[PDB]
Amino acid sequence: MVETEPVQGCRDFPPETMRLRKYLFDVFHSTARKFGFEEYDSPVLESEELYIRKAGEEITEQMFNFITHRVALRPEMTPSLARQLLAKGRSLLLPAKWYSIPQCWRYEAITRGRRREHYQWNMDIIGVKSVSSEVELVCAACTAMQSLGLSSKDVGVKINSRKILQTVVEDKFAPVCVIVPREEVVAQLAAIGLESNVVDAITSTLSLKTIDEIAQRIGEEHEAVRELRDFITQIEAYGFGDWVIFDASVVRGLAYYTGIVFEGFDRDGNFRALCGGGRYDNLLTTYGSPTAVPCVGFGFGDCVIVELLNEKKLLPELHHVVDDLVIPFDETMRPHALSILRRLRDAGRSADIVFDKKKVVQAFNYADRIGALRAVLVAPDEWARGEVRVKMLRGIVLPVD
Amino acid sequence: MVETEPVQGCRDFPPETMRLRKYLFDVFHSTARKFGFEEYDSPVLESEELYIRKAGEEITEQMFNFITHRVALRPEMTPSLARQLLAKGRSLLLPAKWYSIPQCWRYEAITRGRRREHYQWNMDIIGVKSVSSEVELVCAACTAMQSLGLSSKDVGVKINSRKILQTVVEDKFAPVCVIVPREEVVAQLAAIGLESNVVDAITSTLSLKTIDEIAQREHEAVRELRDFITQIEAYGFGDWVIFDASVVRGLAYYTGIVFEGFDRDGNFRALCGGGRYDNLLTTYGSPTAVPCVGFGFGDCVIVELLNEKKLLPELHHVVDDLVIPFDETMRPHALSILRRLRDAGRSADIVFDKKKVVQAFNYADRIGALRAVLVAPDEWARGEVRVKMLRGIVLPVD
């Protein structure tokens, strides 16, 4: 017998499991449709050049490579987005709001945290300078979280700005923050060329928790704080004000971003980040664009949100359901039964039928044992009279219409 | 600037194109549901052992391999199905009707026919001994074609049985048939230890186009084929099926009835294809045989066909509402209405940057439109908004 289990770190989706996934993904689809986002997709097989341009040669070892001309299974979707946006050039109508729910592949260890394969709701608005796209993308994250059953008490989203930090500096420094003792960061920063004073500027602003505190520091009129104040005022206006919080220690990939970053989280501090996003105006120029084009997006993993929903008892109990089981009285009634199955399906209903020979009470079980709703006995006595027997699993003669 | 095009032979799906993929797959999903099939999925990355056990070492060249322990990007879905069903063992509740639309990868050339990457509607009934499971899958095939706009004048399904060909012989022969000149076979028949007399049987049976010709030649095969046709006509797809004794696509790997969707003007390759494989699970090491019939329905040839017959739809990005702030002072209140609309179940968008109104209205039409919502201060003060349908007006609105 073959290995019945799937390749290390990868999940099968039998009907039971796939039902939950379609439940979660429905929410992403539904949120995106309500928010006016269009779906896209690209191949999981992308050119090695695509990622190594983003992060360097280092990432060739953390992904599934192979040759044909080298290609790899994508560990993230964003690089394919830009490649697609770039292909469209100046014919791409802005603003453009694109989303996908792509699988991604990362070659790592399995019993140490991550699991080699995950689905992910990406979500990206392109062509929009102002801070209303940050506001909306966050509104989306909460709208999804809210549809899943979460309240502002359960979760929320932290806001930061890399313009706070960069302006406090007055080149390649933002990498150092992402890693964290606290006396190891100064050894990593001073090496750049920062006298102890300016290290403190950075070090101690990160654990600041209010905008006023940022203002009494860079100014009220600074872009950085002028935006955040606009962002909050809009998010409050859209009605998610109780969901957002400000936190200067959001530094997840702050090198790779440009403006407002954000990060979903559970308020009991039990899990890793739910979703993460921000503005990256330098996205397209990275991949060689002559004209910098504004961009904000977030990624919404399919793994952590489940753990939380499960913790907070919000995972639904989903079942295969069908409207009708057609039961031929016996094999001689098959052809008539068939024609009743057609009718039902034609009418929009979902119906199924006894395939092999069953005893009628065995058929009635099967109807219950699979989804039920309604059993349609198809017998000669009744059929001759233009009739069928219909039993609701909440006999009765009907034509039915 | 990077290569903006995808890996040779693979397709990008921008919104324009994804709309058509989503449209086809909706016929797959919607048909699956109505026939009471359950969706499944498994990793595109499977174990090499799994496929090599299907067809021999040769395929280790016709797919994307790599090492970690050897694994491959799947060229077909069925071997995952088998692997999953086996995992469940006896606990799998029979009959199970499992479907999926997996993407699959085959390492081939690009300007010679095929294209390395394709999505494919699978569909499998497991645990059914009788010819009814064959009947339905075909109904499912014909029904999905019928929902795309195709009639029985356009397409059809061919039917055949491997029992026809096997019983005529009275071991490893079926592989030779699949490769098609009526002579280019004949030497590949004689050259493996068969007399002329048997080559005349095999050849003359493939050259039969009616069931009566098979029966004139009470057997299991014709009992089935007559019961199937009966059933199919009873369901209402009699004009769609047709017997053909030359359907030998992969017939080594099937057990009973096999079938093959096709366009009637003879213009394209096979639309869909499948059959009964009762040996499917025993192959992957099942001690107890479990019946299986199923089919694959590619996402490529059906589109070429739908294109030729002019059946492809004009899909558009559509949005119910564009919320228009009069200016940036009205943004917070615009936002609040935006919330209301989206909460009310509608799909809305908003003007993000600073725009003029006639510019804003252009964007409205330029993206789906249906309705604009002007949110100006005069009207807002009196608890009102301006609603212009792209088929002003003051409203509360509720």
Automatic annotation (TrEMBL), chain A:
L-histidine binds at E76, M77, T78, R106, Q120, D124, R252, Y256, Y257. GO terms for biological process: histidyl-tRNA aminoacylation. Its EC number is 6.1.1.21. Keywords: Aminoacyl-tRNA synthetase, ATP-binding, Ligase, Nucleotide-binding, Protein biosynthesis. It comes from the Eukaryota. One of its GO terms (cellular component) is cytoplasm. Residues 19-316 form the Aminoacyl-transfer RNA synthetases class-II family profile domain. The keyword Lyase does not apply. InterPro entries: aa-tRNA-synth_II (IPR006195), aa-tRNA-synth_II/BPL/LPL (IPR045864), Anticodon-bd (IPR004154), Anticodon-bd_dom_sf (IPR036621), His-tRNA-ligase (IPR015807), HisRS-like_core (IPR041715), HisRS/HisZ (IPR004516). The keyword Amino-acid biosynthesis does not apply. It catalyses: tRNA(His) + L-histidine + ATP = L-histidyl-tRNA(His) + AMP + diphosphate + H(+). CDD domains: HisRS-like_core. One of its GO terms (molecular function) is ATP binding. It holds the Pfam family tRNA-synt_His. SUPFAM superfamilies: Class II aaRS ABD-related (SSF52954), Class II aaRS and biotin synthetases (SSF55681). PROSITE patterns: AA_TRNA_LIGASE_II. Belongs to the class-II aminoacyl-tRNA synthetase family. This is histidine--tRNA ligase.
UniProtKB/TrEMBL annotation, chain B:
Its EC number is 6.1.1.21. The keyword Nucleotide-binding applies. L-histidine binds at E76, M77, T78, R106, Q120, D124, R249, Y253, Y254. GO terms for biological process: histidyl-tRNA aminoacylation. GO terms for cellular component: cytoplasm. Residues 19-313 form the Aminoacyl-transfer RNA synthetases class-II family profile domain. The keyword Nucleotidyltransferase does not apply. PANTHER family: HISTIDINE--TRNA LIGASE, MITOCHONDRIAL-RELATED, HISTIDYL-TRNA SYNTHETASE. It catalyses: tRNA(His) + L-histidine + ATP = L-histidyl-tRNA(His) + AMP + diphosphate + H(+). This is histidine--tRNA ligase. One of its GO terms (molecular function) is histidine-tRNA ligase activity. Signal peptide: none annotated. The gene is Tb06.4M18.280. Belongs to the class-II aminoacyl-tRNA synthetase family. Keywords: Aminoacyl-tRNA synthetase, ATP-binding, Ligase, Nucleotide-binding, Protein biosynthesis. It holds the Pfam family tRNA-synt_His. HAMAP family: His_tRNA_synth (MF_00127). It is an enzyme of class 6 (ligase).
